[PDB]
Amino acid sequence: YDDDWQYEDCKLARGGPPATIVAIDEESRNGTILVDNMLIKGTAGGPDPTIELSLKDNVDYWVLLDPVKQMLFLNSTGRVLDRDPPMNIHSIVVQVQCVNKKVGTVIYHEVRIVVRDRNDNSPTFKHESYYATVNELTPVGTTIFTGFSGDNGATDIDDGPNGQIEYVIQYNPEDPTSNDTFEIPLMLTGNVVLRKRLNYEDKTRYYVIIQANDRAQNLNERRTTTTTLTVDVLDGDDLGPMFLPCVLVPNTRDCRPLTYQAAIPELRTPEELNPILVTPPIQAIDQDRNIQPPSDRPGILYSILVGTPEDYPRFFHMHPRTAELTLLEPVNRDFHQKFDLVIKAEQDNGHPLPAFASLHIEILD
Amino acid sequence: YDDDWQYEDCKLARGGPPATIVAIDEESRNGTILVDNMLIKGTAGGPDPTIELSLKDNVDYWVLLDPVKQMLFLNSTGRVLDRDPPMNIHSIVVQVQCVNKKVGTVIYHEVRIVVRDRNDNSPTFKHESYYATVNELTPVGTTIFTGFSGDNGATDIDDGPNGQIEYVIQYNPEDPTSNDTFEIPLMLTGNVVLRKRLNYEDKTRYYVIIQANDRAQNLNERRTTTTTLTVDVLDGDDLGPMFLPCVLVPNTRDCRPLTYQAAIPELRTPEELNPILVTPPIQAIDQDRNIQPPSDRPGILYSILVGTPEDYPRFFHMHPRTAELTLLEPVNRDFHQKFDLVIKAEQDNGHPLPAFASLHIEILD
Ligand SMILES: *[C@@H]1O[C@H](CO)[C@@H](O)[C@H](O)[C@H]1NC(C)=O
Ligand SMILES: *[C@@H]1O[C@H](CO)[C@@H](O)[C@H](O)[C@H]1NC(C)=O
Ligand SMILES: *[C@@H]1O[C@H](CO)[C@@H](O)[C@H](O)[C@H]1NC(C)=O
Ligand SMILES: *[C@@H]1O[C@H](CO)[C@@H](O)[C@H](O)[C@H]1NC(C)=O
Ligand SMILES: *[C@@H]1O[C@H](CO)[C@@H](O)[C@H](O)[C@H]1NC(C)=O
Ligand SMILES: *[C@@H]1O[C@H](CO)[C@@H](O)[C@H](O)[C@H]1NC(C)=O
Ligand SMILES: *[C@H]1O[C@H](CO)[C@@H](O)[C@H](O)[C@@H]1O
Ligand SMILES: *[C@H]1O[C@H](CO)[C@@H](O)[C@H](O)[C@@H]1O
Ligand SMILES: *[C@H]1O[C@H](CO)[C@@H](O)[C@H](O)[C@@H]1O
Ligand SMILES: *[C@H]1O[C@H](CO)[C@@H](O)[C@H](O)[C@@H]1O
Ligand SMILES: *[C@H]1O[C@H](CO)[C@@H](O)[C@H](O)[C@@H]1O
Ligand SMILES: *[C@H]1O[C@H](CO)[C@@H](O)[C@H](O)[C@@H]1O
Ligand SMILES: *[C@H]1O[C@H](CO)[C@@H](O)[C@H](O)[C@@H]1O
Ligand SMILES: *[C@H]1O[C@H](CO)[C@@H](O)[C@H](O)[C@@H]1O
Numbered sequence A, B: 001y002d003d004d005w006q007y008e009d010c011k012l013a014r015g016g017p018p019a020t021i022v023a024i025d026e027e028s029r030n031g032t033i034l035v036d037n038m039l040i041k042g043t044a045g046g047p048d049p050t051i052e053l054s055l056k057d058n059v060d061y062w063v064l065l066d067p068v069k070q071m072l073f074l075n076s077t078g079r080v081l082d083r084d085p086p087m088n089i090h091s092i093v094v095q096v097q098c099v100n101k102k103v104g105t106v107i108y109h110e111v112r113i114v115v116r117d118r119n120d121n122s123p124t125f126k127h128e129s130y131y132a133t134v135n136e137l138t139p140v141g142t143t144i145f146t147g148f149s150g151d152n153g154a155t156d157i158d159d160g161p162n163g164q165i166e167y168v169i170q171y172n173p174e175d176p177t178s179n180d181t182f183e184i185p186l187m188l189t190g191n192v193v194l195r196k197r198l199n200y201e202d203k204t205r206y207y208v209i210i211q212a213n214d215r216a217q218n219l220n221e222r223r224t225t226t227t228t229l230t231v232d233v234l235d236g237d238d239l240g241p242m243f244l245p246c247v248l249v250p251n252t253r254d255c256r257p258l259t260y261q262a263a264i265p266e267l268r269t270p271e272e273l274n275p276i277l278v279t280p281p282i283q284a285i286d287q288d289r290n291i292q293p294p295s296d297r298p299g300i301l302y303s304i305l306v307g308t309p310e311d312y313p314r315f316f317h318m319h320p321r322t323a324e325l326t327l328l329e330p331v332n333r334d335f336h337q338k339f340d341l342v343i344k345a346e347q348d349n350g351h352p353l354p355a356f357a358s359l360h361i362e363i364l365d
């Protein structure tokens, strides 16, 4: 038991916890009052003080004390009280030491100054730009970009909601359909989902403007940074062959074929006549003009699909890769005056998507 | 300093660490020798022993001691020394207590029996079966199933390689193309990737047999469990309309249209004649017969694409949704004897994939 602790000098004349806890905003002005009055019993002033007050553990001298008023001030001339990196000052803790002069006892009064975050930083993207490719056959609802994952996206150095990031697509006045074609359903991840079906024939590149905004409680205080995600559409196999030559029908993408022509002298043999010349030459090309890589491009199979009269298979053979037409036996014109055949060109990859053209063959007297 | 510790009795007559460390396989027989000889100096036998030996900390009585031979045995009658759950006995630790009888000193000799894992457990799948759906337009290389993720896959309760799981596709003799169509490139995840392009018209369900095997060092000792991943293909919009009626060309999927027919009496007015009857009625349907959901199904647009003579737009109008044909002005047969028109039916969804049919119109005297 000690009689020296029975005094009230050096003890706090307030309710609450032993620590004196206060809060100020980061980056507060020099001279900002931290504690207006410590409320420590006793007097440090006068010619016969009963107490002596001083600061201990005043790291980097952030706090100044007036021992008579028992007032603490922020010392920040020439510097900034930054809560964010690189400083990371989330609180300032110091001790007010009080000595009771009558008996020499010492008491420390902790002071904790909580430094409140301001939203003084904007999101920064890891990269200057972002890029994705998407095959045009990709179904709607496919997640086509995850490139903000694993901190490759945006970071904000503020605390709490001030540092939380939401990714949102903006309307792009320079590419008005991009915000209709793509969506970010989960703001917290920034992953981009295909919202509308693509068509390589119509549009092959999109500029998707993606903002990253912080979540400050006050909308007027939120900060925003933008990036562009460039999406290139890759040509997919949604179209089949088209015969050449063709004429485009005005106001359409339908390039219609001609009727191919051939003529066979009656009674001459295949040895004499083959190969049978067709005018213009039968050819077709894939309406998908930029399939990559080249090894994914299909071959085209040519055939005589149907024809009139229906005995044409007795007389004609078409090479399936070259479309070369050969005669199989001599033609007696008493029995066979002409043929009208339908030629098919289709892909050899299980997705035939055929085109059709007519071939007229005259038998000559 | 104590003279009582200057004796060799109760100390180990061997090199190595203070703990006596040995290993046995899990599930070892009752009576399995754990330590053949503790090598403790002194004699516990005879009528004047210099030491006394006993076991301490013998949890659940797994160890038996012969104090004279200094031999330890496994006590496992009626039970199993299981290293795996539910027992989880990875080691057995007991103390051999030695008392030096001349001076009463006590020394404990730790014995650690490491229980080695056997590969006595097979992988178990969380679920009886697994299921995925895949739109047929999905590009090759798409990861189409991740359903083993987050422990929804297979678990093995053995330790180390004995408990590691590899997921591998097996050839399915009941569905021989499924192991060609899908692949698991990362054995450790079991995620399934589309390896070959789908076609709903050809195949709509696959049974993919997926084994989960453990990684026991000896192939003969590895354990395997199988599951089936059922994959259903969803019909996608890769095909356009087809006109009806049609006749299928033998050995093909090409259902060719007829030439539609109409006849218009000369000089009668549109009021008198409309609508112009076409035989058979012009109709088309989507060659994709099971697009889901119904709201994704496109409408069909009908039009007169081209025609001869080329003044037909002065005379005829086709309703784009119903294909109804109307006359726009009376027809003078001195100037117009017949028309041969090409009708197009295409989808209205930006992927027209058109079909074409002929329409012959006679002007009647
Ligand atoms: C900074 O604040 C302290 C405390 O009020 C004050 O003593 C000092 O004069 C101030 N310095 C300047 C340059 O204003
Ligand atoms: C105020 O802070 C600055 C920087 O730490 C320091 O140089 C100065 O000595 C401090 N002033 C006082 C009165 O503690
Ligand atoms: C895209 O931006 C425009 C203009 O702000 C807006 O009308 C439209 O609703 C947006 N589209 C989507 C899918 O949000
Ligand atoms: C089990 O093993 C111990 C130690 O060898 C032995 O004493 C005991 O007889 C054995 N019990 C049976 C039932 O074999
Ligand atoms: C052997 O283990 C069983 C099960 O713990 C126990 O009942 C028995 O008492 C033990 N025997 C000895 C000799 O310790
Ligand atoms: C599928 O299984 C068969 C038979 O084992 C085998 O020939 C074929 O190579 C396998 N396919 C793939 C893609 O591994
Ligand atoms: C693609 O993946 C994202 C998640 O990364 C989903 O949000 C989306 O629905 C799609 O499955
Ligand atoms: C920055 O600006 C964007 C709009 O461009 C807001 O969404 C955000 O709240 C912040 O004010
Ligand atoms: C991201 O995009 C927005 C809108 O174009 C710009 O305001 C910003 O400067 C950044 O380029
Ligand atoms: C990203 O880049 C696009 C142009 O490529 C801009 O329009 C946008 O403002 C952002 O800087
Ligand atoms: C997406 O990336 C392209 C370059 O690949 C840029 O041109 C565009 O501005 C956007 O950043
Ligand atoms: C789908 O996603 C898996 C990983 O989950 C990849 O292994 C695969 O290449 C594809 O991108
Ligand atoms: C179980 O059986 C499979 C083959 O079906 C092996 O891959 C595995 O090593 C284990 O022996
Ligand atoms: C998984 O599939 C394999 C092969 O069909 C079977 O052997 C096993 O019983 C399980 O059904």
Ligand SMILES: *[C@H]1O[C@H](CO)[C@@H](O)[C@H](O)[C@@H]1O
Binding pocket: B174, B207, B209, B226, B227, B228, B229
């Ligand atoms: C999974 O299920 C299929 C049949 O649905 C079996 O063939 C296979 O053996 C496994 O049991």
Ligand SMILES: *[C@H]1O[C@H](CO)[C@@H](O)[C@H](O)[C@@H]1O
Binding pocket: B128, B129, B130, B131, B228, B229, B230, B231
């Ligand atoms: C995949 O799932 C189907 C049922 O949806 C089963 O029929 C098949 O055996 C496999 O387990």
Ligand SMILES: [Ca+2]
Binding pocket: A026, A027, A082, A083, A084, A120
């Ligand atoms: Ca700051």
Ligand SMILES: [Ca+2]
Binding pocket: A026, A083, A084, A117, A118, A119, A120, A121, A157, A158, A159
């Ligand atoms: Ca801040």
Ligand SMILES: [Ca+2]
Binding pocket: A119, A120, A121, A122, A123, A156, A157, A158, A162, A163, A214, A223
């Ligand atoms: Ca911020």
Ligand SMILES: [Ca+2]
Binding pocket: A136, A200, A201, A235, A236, A237, A238, A239, A288
């Ligand atoms: Ca294409």
Ligand SMILES: [Ca+2]
Binding pocket: A236, A237, A238, A239, A240, A241, A286, A287, A288, A347
């Ligand atoms: Ca193609």
Ligand SMILES: [Ca+2]
Binding pocket: B026, B027, B082, B083, B084, B120
């Ligand atoms: Ca076991």
Ligand SMILES: [Ca+2]
Binding pocket: B026, B083, B084, B117, B118, B119, B120, B121, B157, B158, B159
């Ligand atoms: Ca085991």
Ligand SMILES: [Ca+2]
Binding pocket: B119, B120, B121, B122, B123, B156, B157, B158, B162, B163, B214, B223
């Ligand atoms: Ca195992």
Ligand SMILES: [Ca+2]
Binding pocket: B136, B200, B201, B235, B236, B237, B238, B239, B288
């Ligand atoms: Ca389809």
Ligand SMILES: [Ca+2]
Binding pocket: B236, B237, B238, B239, B240, B241, B286, B287, B288, B347
């Ligand atoms: Ca369709």
